[PDB]
Amino acid sequence: SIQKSTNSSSLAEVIDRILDKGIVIDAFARVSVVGIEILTIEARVVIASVDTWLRYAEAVGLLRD
Amino acid sequence: SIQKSTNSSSLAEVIDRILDKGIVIDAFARVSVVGIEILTIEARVVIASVDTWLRYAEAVGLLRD
Amino acid sequence: SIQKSTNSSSLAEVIDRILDKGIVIDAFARVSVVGIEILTIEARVVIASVDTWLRYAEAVGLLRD
Amino acid sequence: SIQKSTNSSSLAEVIDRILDKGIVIDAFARVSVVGIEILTIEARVVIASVDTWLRYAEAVGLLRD
Amino acid sequence: SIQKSTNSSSLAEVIDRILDKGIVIDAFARVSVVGIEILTIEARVVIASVDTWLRYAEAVGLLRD
């Protein structure tokens, strides 16, 4: 191709650049009464391409040893 | 590309620059009566890219030893 | 880029400069009758980027020893 | 940048300059009858950036020894 | 900057100059009948920046010895 005065790029390349960084959303909350932990919530979400989800899974320990 | 008189940058690069710094929102409250801790709340939220959520997780201790 | 006669900066850089200083909001109150501490409240909130929330957490003692 | 005839500065820098000095609001009251301290109130509030809230916390004694 | 014929200064600098002097408001009253101190009130309020509230607290004795 040829060089241009503008940097702007394609939608499919925005998607690819998002997925090979990935996203983690992570949260917890706890509610206690008189010292007893009467309610608790924990949640996590991960989104990525395969080659980066393997990075996550190999560090956390979901692949075979 | 070529140099310009203005610095302004793309939306996908704002998103990437936010996620590789990450965000932590952290809070607790306690209500006590006669010296007994009759109610308590604690919460935390984390948002990041995978490579920076691993920074958090390795310092706090969520990865295998 | 090139130098200009004005200093003004981008919204994403205001956000980044806030989060790498962080914010702490901290309060307590106590109500006592005849010498007995019949009611008490304590609360704290913290907001930061990951690299500065780790500063807080390492000084207060939330990371593994 | 270049020098100017006026000193005026940005809103984000006012906020930063407030938070790295911090604010303490501190009060108590006591009501006594026949020599017995039948009612009492105490309250405190602190606001700062992380690096200055640590100054407060290290002098008052909220960090690990 | 450059020198001018007038001394006037910014609102954020008025606030800073107030808080690093601080304010103390202090009062008590006592009502006695036949020689018995049947009612009494005492109150205090303090406002400052952190570095000057520590001056108060170190002289009165609220910091660890």
Numbering used by the authors:
A (entry chain N), B (entry chain N), C (entry chain N), D (entry chain N), E (entry chain N): 2 to 66
Sentences from the paper on this structure:
We expressed and purified Bacillus megaterium GVs that form narrow tubes most suitable for cryo-EM analysis. We used a combination of two- and three-dimensional (2D and 3D) classification techniques to select 4% of the small GV subset corresponding to 35.6 nm diameter and used helical reconstruction to obtain a cryo-EM density of 3.2 Å resolution. The cylindrical shell is constructed from thousands of GvpA2 monomers polymerized side by side into ribs spiraling into a left-handed helix with a helical pitch of 48.8 Å and −3.87° helical twist, resulting in 92.93 GvpA2 units per helical turn. Contrary to postulated models, GvpA monomers and not antiparallel dimers form the repeating units of the helical assembly. The carboxyl-terminal residues Asp67-Ile88 are flexible and not resolved in our structure. The central β-hairpin, tilted at −36° relative to the long axis of the cylinder, forms the core of the GV ribs. Helix α2 folds back onto the hairpin, and helix α1 forms a bridge across the ∼16 Å gap separating adjacent ribs. The inner wall of the GV shell forms a continuous hydrophobic surface consisting of a dense pattern of hydrophobic residues located on the luminal side of the β-hairpin and helix α1. We located pores in the GV shell formed by slit-like openings between α1 helices of adjacent GpvA2 monomers. GvpA2 monomers are held together tightly by lateral connections along the GV ribs formed by an extensive hydrogen-bonding network between the β strand backbones.
